[PDB]
Amino acid sequence: KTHVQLSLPVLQVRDVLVRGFGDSVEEVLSEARQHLKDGTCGLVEVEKGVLPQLEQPYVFIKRSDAAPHGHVMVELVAELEGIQYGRSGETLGVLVPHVGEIPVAYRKVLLRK
16 A cells, blocks of 8 residues: 555653664665554654754654545655755654653554555
8 A cells, every 4th residue: 555544652752762763864764664664653743942852864754735534644754964855745743763652642644655
């Protein structure tokens, strides 16, 4: 399937134990996709002071369209030193590994895979 329905656990930035996916744009996008597939991916909602507490490169989920079955259609965009790899809509948040942190909410997305 070109798209997969996911429910992403929303984590508080100060709870997150593994603060990024890796060391290159290509690695973080690869790892993010693997974690999304394995259900081991969390979402941190971006506000003032969140991104400096996480590790670059960042992986964002961005709205790709204006929402089947409650699931917002999203795609992956990475960022390293102010340059983004991909072009998409509004940021829904930054992806991180989920290693058992308690979420505050869930974000229903349809992931272009």
